[PDB]
Amino acid sequence: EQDRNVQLSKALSYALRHGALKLGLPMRADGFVPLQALLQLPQFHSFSIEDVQLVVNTNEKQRFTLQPGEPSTGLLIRANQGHSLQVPELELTPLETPQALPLTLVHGTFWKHWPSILLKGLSRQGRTHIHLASGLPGDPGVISGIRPNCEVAVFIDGPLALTDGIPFFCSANGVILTPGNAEGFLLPKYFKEALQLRPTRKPLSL
Numbered sequence: 015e016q017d018r019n020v021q022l023s024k025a026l027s028y029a030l031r032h033g034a035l036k037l038g039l040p041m042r043a044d045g046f047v048p049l050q051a052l053l054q055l056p057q058f059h060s061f062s063i064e065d066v067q068l069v070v071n072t073n074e075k076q077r078f079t080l081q082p083g084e085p086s087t088g089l090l091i092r093a094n095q096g097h098s099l100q101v102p103e104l105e106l107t108p109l110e111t112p113q114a115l116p117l118t119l120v121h122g123t124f125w126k127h128w129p130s131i132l133l134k135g136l137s138r139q140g141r142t143h144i145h146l147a148s149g150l151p152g153d154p155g156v157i158s159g160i161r162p163n164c165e166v167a168v169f170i171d172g173p174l175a176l177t178d179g180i181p182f183f184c185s186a187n188g189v190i191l192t193p194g195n196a197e198g199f200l201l202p203k204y205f206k207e208a209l210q211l212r213p214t215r216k217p218l219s220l
């Protein structure tokens with residue numbers, strides 16, 4: 015069962031973040047798709063509505079929102095962040111002042127990307143938003159937004175980037191998102207500090 019819930023969660027992630035258009039799903043600009051249309055895709059034929067409710071209600075990163083739609087349509091489901099698809103109307107809380115930012119704003123990543131990040135800044139890469147978290151893995155209130163196996167973390171100067179015009183958003187599961195600048199980048203001008211997390215915690219020079 016724990017396999018099937020994980021498997022459903024990964025199939026939901028893929029379809030709702032990346033695959034909807036390739037799959038023929040009628041997904042809205044806000045990232046919602048009728049659950050009934052999704053459950054009629056062959057890869058979902060083994061899952062029930064109760065199965066989907068359970069994965070939505072219990073997945074630790076709160077990846078999904080499930081809500082009632084129009085009378086004819088039934089339940090709607092979306093991924094709360096992480097899209098490569100264009101979902102410009104996805105419901106996000108704008109974070110427009112220093113006060114609305116979390117005190118800690120950090121991106122976890124890996125040695126493989128570290129030289130390129132120091133050179134060009136953080137890039138949204140294949141996704142709509144650079145993903146940031148309000149703490150390191152394990153910290154209070156951090157349910158998503160930073161991978162648990164990260165080797166390095168770069169802390170972001172939220173207020174600086176705000177002054178320079180970079181917009182930030184908070185997703186429903188608490189991920190801080192920024193589209194970056196015009197080219198999809200959070201330039202190194204905004205790197206407050208850096209920290210090695212693996213194998214041990216050690217400071218790192220920017």
Ligand SMILES: Nc1ncnc2c1ncn2[C@@H]1O[C@H](COP(=O)(O)OP(=O)(O)OC[C@H]2O[C@H](OP(=O)(O)O)[C@H](O)[C@@H]2O)[C@@H](O)[C@H]1O
Nearest residue numbers: 075123127130131134135136137139141145158159160161
């Ligand atoms: N200039 C640059 N050059 C080279 N590499 C660069 C770079 N700039 C950044 N990178 C790195 O390019 C990779 C893209 O990788 P990704 O698209 O998966 O982004 P991410 O790792 O943040 O993951 C998103 C959420 O996904 C998970 O959530 P879930 O479990 O899926 O629900 C977590 O919550 C996560 O917050 C990352 O390593 C970047 O560090």
Ligand SMILES: OC[C@@H](O)[C@@H](O)[C@H](O)[C@@H](O)CO
Nearest residue numbers: 019020023024069072073074
């Ligand atoms: O995206 C799959 C994830 O790895 C999974 O662990 C879910 O959090 C959980 O299985 C659903 O309840």
Ligand SMILES: OC[C@@H](O)[C@@H](O)[C@H](O)[C@@H](O)CO
Nearest residue numbers: 032033097098139140141142
């Ligand atoms: O369809 C796009 C492709 O799947 C990739 O760009 C995603 O942005 C993401 O990186 C998937 O993990």
